From a paper:
[name], a highly calcium-selective [name] channel, is overexpressed in endometrial cancers, leukemia, and carcinomas of the breast, prostate, colon, ovarian, and thyroid. [name] has four subunits that form a transmembrane domain (TMD) with a central ion channel pore, an intracellular skirt domain enclosing a large cavity, and amphipathic [name] helices that run nearly parallel to the membrane and interact with both the TMD and the skirt. The TMD is composed of transmembrane helices S1–S6 and a re-entrant pore loop (P-loop) between S5 and S6. The first four transmembrane helices form a bundle to constitute the S1–S4 domain.
The strongest increase in potency of calcium uptake inhibition by 2-[name] was observed for the mutant [name]*-[name]. To shed light on the structural basis of this phenotype, we crystallized [name]*-[name] in the presence and absence of 2-[name]. In the absence of 2-[name], the C-terminal (cytoplasmic) part of S2 in [name]*-[name] is splayed away from the binding pocket by ~4 Å relative to its position in [name]*-Y466A2-[name]. In turn, 2-[name] seems to glue the S2 helix back, perhaps by virtue of its tail amino group interaction with E402. Y466 in [name]* is highly conserved throughout the entire TRPV subfamily. In turn, a more loose binding pocket, such as the one observed in [name]*-[name], might cause reduction in [name]* affinity to the S1–S4 lipid and, as a result, increased affinity to 2-[name].
Author numbering:
A (entry chain A), B (entry chain A): 28 to 637
C-alpha cells in the first residue's frame, strides 16, 4: 500500500547513505573524511540522495554542525537547495535546522542567506490522520510549534512574515491551535502577536482560514479550552469591581448567531468533535445558552409539541373510525381460517358522521405539504450531513417524520384505488407518528437524558447484537419445526409452517408465551429435550446482556450523558432561532449603540469569587 | 424583564461616566484634571450620575484615595450624600469604602463625620435569590461580613451600634450566619460580642429575628454546623474530668420542644433546607432524639399501628360479607355478556349474622369522625405547608387517609340510596386503607429506608416517565386495533373495542399476558410484523429503566437515604410529643430546680476521647 512505500523508502534512504561515502561521512560526523572527499577527490558535492536530499540535508537531520559547516564552506549553494522527492518536496536545510532547535546552525544558515519563505509542500507535511505532526509549511511555523522562542524572533529578524499562509490558508496562529501542548502554546501565541502592525484592522487574529474560520473561532470548533480561555481576554471588558463582585462585559460578536454560519455556536453543534461540547459550558457561552432556552426557547419547543400531538391525535381519530367493512364476497370456504370483513371500495358515503372524517383527512395533506416544505429543503442548499448537522427540527428521530408524510401520501394513493393492502400503509404512520412524540422528551425534564440511552441503543449496539440473537433462533426455531412437522398440529401446533416456526420461537426467546405444552397427548421425544436447552440458553443471553449494560453507568458517563443531553438542548435552541422569524426571539444582550462603546451586542455577566 | 433592566443600567452608568468629564476623571484617577474642572471651571460639583451617584461615589467604587481626597477638600458635603437611584437608595460613600476594605479612606471619611447609621435600602442590598451577596444595610454589617477586623472596631469607635437591625430585623449577628466563609466568621462573631454591655439579659445573642428566630436558633435552621458547634460552647457545662472520660452538661433550653414553636427541633423537621438534617446528628441533639424514640416513642408508634391495622382489618370484614346479591331482574338478554348478580336495595335484614355487620359499620363513622377531627385541624390554625410541614400523623402518605374517610362517608351515602355504583366507593377504601399501612414501615426496622425509595419514586420520577410510557402505547395499541378491527373477534379478540385495545396492549407492555396468539386461524399479515417490534421496544425501555435506576445507589446516597429515614423518624417523634398529652411522655433531661444551678432542664452526656 502507501504505508509500505514510506517504510520502504526510509529503509532505501539508509542504503543510499551507506553506499554514498560522502553522505555517510556527513551522517557519521567524520570531518576528516569530508575534506578527503572534496579537496583531493572531486566527489560531486551536489550528490542527490534517495529522497533527493543533499549532503547538507543529512548533516542537518542528525545534528552535525561540524560536518554541516564544512559543506557550506566547500559549497555555499547547498543552502538554497530543496529536497526533490515527493514526500519531502520543498523542504530546505533551514527547515531541518529549526525543527531540531539547532540554534547555532540556524544562525549560520541565516547568515548564508537562506530563504525564510521556502514552503515544504511534501506530502509528509500535510494535515492528515496518518501524519503524526502538522507544523505548517513555513520555517517560522516550525519555529513557533517546537516552542523555541529564541528562533522565532531570530527568524522574524531576517524577514519572516507572520501573515504568511500555508496551502490550507492557515496562518502560524491557526497552527498553534492544532497542537497538543496547550499551556506552552499560549505564551508563544502572544509573542507572535507582538510583531503585528498595531492597527485595529488587518490584525493577524482577524485573518481567516480558507473554510471561513478565524483563530478565535477555530479554537471553539477544535475544543481547545486553554486557547479559548486565553483568547477571551482580548474581547472581555470589566465594568467595575465592588468587593468580591465583578461586573464584566463580553463582546459576544463572533460568538453569537448574527453573522450567518460564521457563528461559533452553530459550529459546535454541527461539528463531530466530542471535545467542542465542553466549550459551550464556558462562562461566556453558558449564560447565553441558558438565557436562550429558559426564555423564548422552552415555550416554543412545547408549543410545537402541543401542535404536533394535536395533529397526530386527530389523525389517529380518522384511522379508528375508518371505512365500513361488511365483507361482500363470503368466500370463507377457501382458506376456511380466513375471517376478513374488508372496507375497501365504497368511495365515501352520505355525510353526517362521514363529513367530519374528510376534514380530519384534509389535515393529512397539510402535514404532507408542510413536511414536503421540510423535504424540499432536505436537498435544497444542504444535503449530506449539512441536513443531519442542521436538522434540529426534531434533530434526533425526525428522519421518520418525512417517511410518515410519505406513508400519508401513499395512503392517499391507497385510497381512490381501494386496494387490499389498505391497512399496511395506514398502520406505519400510527407507530411512527407517536414514537416520534418522544423526540419532544429531549429537553423538557429529566427524561431527556433517558431518551439519549434508548436513542443510542436503537441505532448502535442493537443491530450488531440482534444478529447474534438472530442466530441460535435459526438453530432452535428450525429444529422445533422439524420435531413438530411429523405430528398433528390441530392441537399444540405452535410451528405449523416455517414462517410461524420462527415467529413462535422468537416470542419464546423473550418468554412472552407460556411455551408450547400439551398434556392430553404425548409430545415428541425431542421437544422435551430441546426445549430445556432453549430455556437455559435464552436466560444466559438475557443475563449477560443485562450485565453487559454495565459497559456504561460509570459516573463519568452519568456526567457524559448529562453533557450530551444539555448539549443537544443547546442544539435545539440554535436552529429554532434560525428558522423562526426575526420579529419573535429578540437577540440576546444589549446593543453597543446608544452607549457608543461598541456598536456590537454585549452580555452583562457579573460573578463572585470565594 | 428585570435582569435586563439592571444590565441596561450598568451599561447606562458607564456612558454617563464617559460623557461626564468630572465623573470620568474620578474613575480614571486623573488628579490634575479634577483641579481644572473645579477651580478654573465651575463644574457643578454635585453632579448626579445615572445611578444618582456623586463624583465621590465613583471615586470610592474604583479605589481612588487621591481622587477621593480632592473631592472632599473642594466640597465636604459630598460625604453625607446618599445615592438616589432605586437599586442603590440609601448607600453612602462610607458603604463603598468599607466594602473595598479601603482602610485609609474609611478613616478619612469618619474624620469627616460620615454617619455610621445610614441604611442602604436599595433593592440590590435585599436578601433575594437573584442578589449574589447579602451584607445587611448598615456599614458595620458590611465591615463584619468582609472580615476586616480593623474596620469593625474602627467603626464601633465612632459610635457604631451592634444592636442595630435591618429591615428584616436581623442584627449583625444574624447576617454572619448567612455567609459562606464559616471558619472566618466565627472569629469575627466573637469580636462583635466583646462590645456587649455585659449584662446577662439584653445580650445581643438573645435579640430575636422578626420571624421569631435568634442567632443560635437560626444557625440550626440554616444548617451552619460550624457556627452551631461554636455557639454551643456558650451553653454547655463540664461537670468533671476523670481520665479520658468527661461528663458534660448541656443547657437544652432553646433546643428542646417546651417553648412552643420556638423549639429548634421543630424548625429542622419543618424546614425545606436539606442542610439542616446534619444538625440533628450533632452530639447534643443526637442523644436527645435517640433517647426520645428508643423509649416512649417507638412503642406508641407501634400501638397506633396495632390500632390502625385492627381498625382496617375489621372494616374489610364488613366488605367481604356485604349485602345479598340475587339478581331480581333477569335482564340477561340485553348485553348477553352481562352476568351481574347485584346486592343493592334490601335495607338490611333480620339480624343474627346481620347484626354484627352493623357494629362493624359503626366503626366506620368513628374513623370518619376521628379523621374529621383530623380534617378540621387540616385548615384550622395551619394550612398551606404548615400542615404538610406539621403532619407527622403518618407524615408521608396520610393525605389519603382523609380521602379514605371521605370514601367511607360517600359509601354511607352510597348506602340508604342503593345505587348501582356501590362497589366503586367501597373498593377505593380497601386499597388506600392497606396501602397506608406501610406508612408504619417508616421507622420500625430496615424497611423504612426502603419505603423512602418507593415513596420518592411514586411522586417524582414516575409521573414524567409514565408519560413516555403512555406514548408508544398510543402508537402500538391503536395500531393493533386497526389490524384486528377487520377480523372476527369471537376467537382471539384482544382488542375488540378501543378502550380494550389500550388496556390489552398496556398489559402486554409488562408482558403479563401470553400475548395474543391463535394458530387455528391465520392472523392478519401486520399483526406478526407489528408485534415483533413491540416485543423488542418494550424490552429496551424496561432495560434502560433498570439501568436508569443506577442514577442513585452511589454510596453517598446510601448514606443520604439512611440520613433521610432517620431524620424522618426524628420527624415522627416530635409531633407525637406535640399531640400527645403532657402526662404521658415525660420531658427529657433533669430539671435545674432542686439543684439550683439552672431552673432549666439539662441532659447529662458523658463522652470518651481516644
Ligand atoms: C526522510 C527525510 N530525509 C531526512 O534526512 N529526514 C527526513 C525524515 C522524515 C522527517 C519528517 C517525518 C514526518 O514528518 O513524519
Ligand atoms: C452600580 C453601583 N454604582 C457604583 O458606583 N457601584 C455600584 C455597583 C454595584 C455594587 C453592588 C452590586 C450588588 O450588590 O450586586
Ligand atoms: Ca411471564
Ligand atoms: Ca404467561
Amino acid at each position: 500500500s502507501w504505508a509500505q512505500s514510506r517504510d520502504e523508502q526510509n529503509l532505501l534512504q539508509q542504503k543510499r547513505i551507506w553506499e554514498s561515502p560522502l553522505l555517510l561521512a556527513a551522517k557519521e560526523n567524520n570531518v576528516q573524511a569530508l575534506y578527503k572527499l572534496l579537496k583531493f577527490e572531486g566527489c560531486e558535492v551536489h550528490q542527490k540522495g534517495a529522497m533527493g536530499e543533499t549532503a547538507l540535508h543529512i548533516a542537518a537531520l542528525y545534528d552535525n554542525n561540524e560536518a554541516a559547516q564544512v559543506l557550506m564552506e566547500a559549497a555555499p549553494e547547498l543552502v538554497f537547495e530543496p529536497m526533490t522527492s515527493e514526500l519531502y518536496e520543498g523542504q530546505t536545510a533551514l527547515h531541518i535546522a529549526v525543527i531540531n532547535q539547532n540554534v547555532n546552525l540556524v544562525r549560520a544558515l541565516l547568515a548564508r542567506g537562506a530563504s525564510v519563505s521556502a514552503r515544504a509542500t511534501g506530502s509528509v507535511f500535510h494535515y492528515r490522520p496518518h501524519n503524526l505532526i502538522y507544523y505548517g509549511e513555513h520555517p517560522l511555523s516550525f519555529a513557533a510549534c517546537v516552542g523555541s522562542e529564541e528562533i522565532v524572533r531570530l527568524l522574524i529578524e531576517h524577514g519572516a512574515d507572520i501573515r504568511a499562509q500555508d496551502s490550507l490558508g492557515n496562518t502560524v496562529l491557526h497552527i498553534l491551535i492544532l497542537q497538543p501542548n496547550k499551556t506552552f502554546a499560549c505564551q508563544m501565541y502572544n509573542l507572535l502577536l507582538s510583531y503585528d502592525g498595531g492597527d485595529h484592522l488587518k490584525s493577524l487574529e482577524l485573518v481567516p482560514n480558507n473554510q471561513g474560520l478565524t483563530p478565535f473561532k477555530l479554537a471553539g470548533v477544535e475544543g481547545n479550552i486553554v486557547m479559548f480561555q486565553h483568547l477571551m481576554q482580548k474581547r472581555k471588558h470589566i465594568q467595575w469591581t465592588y468587593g468580591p463582585l465583578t461586573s464584566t462585559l463580553y463582546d459576544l460578536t463572533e460568538i453569537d448567531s448574527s453573522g450567518d454560519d460564521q457563528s461559533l455556536l452553530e459550529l459546535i453543534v454541527t461539528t463531530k468533535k466530542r471535545e467542542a461540547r465542553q466549550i459551550l459550558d464556558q462562562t461566556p457561552v453558558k449564560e447565553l445558552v441558558s438565557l436562550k432556552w429558559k426564555r423564548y426557547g422552552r415555550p416554543y419547543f412545547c408549543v410545537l409539541g402541543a401542535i404536533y400531538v394535536l395533529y397526530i391525535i386527530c389523525f389517529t381519530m380518522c384511522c379508528v373510525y375508518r371505512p365500513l367493512k361488511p365483507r361482500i364476497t363470503n368466500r370463507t370456504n377457501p382458506r376456511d381460517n380466513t375471517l376478513l370483513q374488508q372496507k375497501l371500495l365504497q368511495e365515501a358515503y352520505v355525510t353526517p358522521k362521514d363529513d367530519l372524517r374528510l376534514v380530519g383527512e384534509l389535515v393529512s395533506i397539510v402535514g404532507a405539504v408542510i413536511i414536503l416544505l421540510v423535504e424540499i429543503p432536505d436537498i435544497f442548499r444542504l444535503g449530506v450531513t449539512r441536513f443531519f448537522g442542521q436538522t434540529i427540527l426534531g434533530g434526533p428521530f425526525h428522519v421518520i417524520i418525512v417517511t410518515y408524510a410519505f406513508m400519508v401520501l401513499v395512503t392517499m394513493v391507497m385510497r381512490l384505488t381501494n386496494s387490499d393492502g389498505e391497512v399496511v400503509p395506514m398502520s406505519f404512520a400510527l407507530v411512527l407518528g407517536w414514537c416520534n412524540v418522544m423526540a419532544f422528551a429531549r429537553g423538557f425534564q429529566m427524561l431527556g437524558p433517558f431518551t439519549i440511552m434508548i436513542q443510542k441503543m436503537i441505532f448502535g449496539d442493537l443491530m450488531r447484537f440482534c444478529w447474534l440473537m438472530a442466530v441460535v433462533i435459526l438453530g432452535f426455531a428450525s429444529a422445533f419445526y422439524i420435531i413438530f412437522q411429523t405430528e398433528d398440529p390441530d392441537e399444540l401446533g405452535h410451528f405449523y409452517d416455517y414462517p410461524m416456526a420462527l415467529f413462535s420461537t422468537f416470542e419464546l426467546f423473550l418468554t412472552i408465551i407460556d411455551g408450547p405444552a400439551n398434556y392430553d397427548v404425548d409430545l415428541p421425544f425431542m421437544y422435551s429435550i430441546t426445549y430445556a436447552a432453549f430455556a437455559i440458553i435464552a436466560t444466559l443471553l438475557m443475563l449477560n446482556l443485562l450485565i453487559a449494560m454495565m459497559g456504561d453507568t460509570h459516573w463519568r458517563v452519568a456526567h457524559e450523558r448529562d453533557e450530551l443531553w444539555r448539549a443537544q438542548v443547546v442544539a435545539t435552541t440554535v436552529m429554532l432561532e434560525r428558522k423562526l422569524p426575526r420579529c419573535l426571539w429578540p437577540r440576546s444582550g444589549i446593543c453597543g449603540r446608544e452607549y457608543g462603546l461598541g456598536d456590537r451586542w454585549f452580555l452583562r455577566v457579573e460573578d463572585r469569587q470565594d
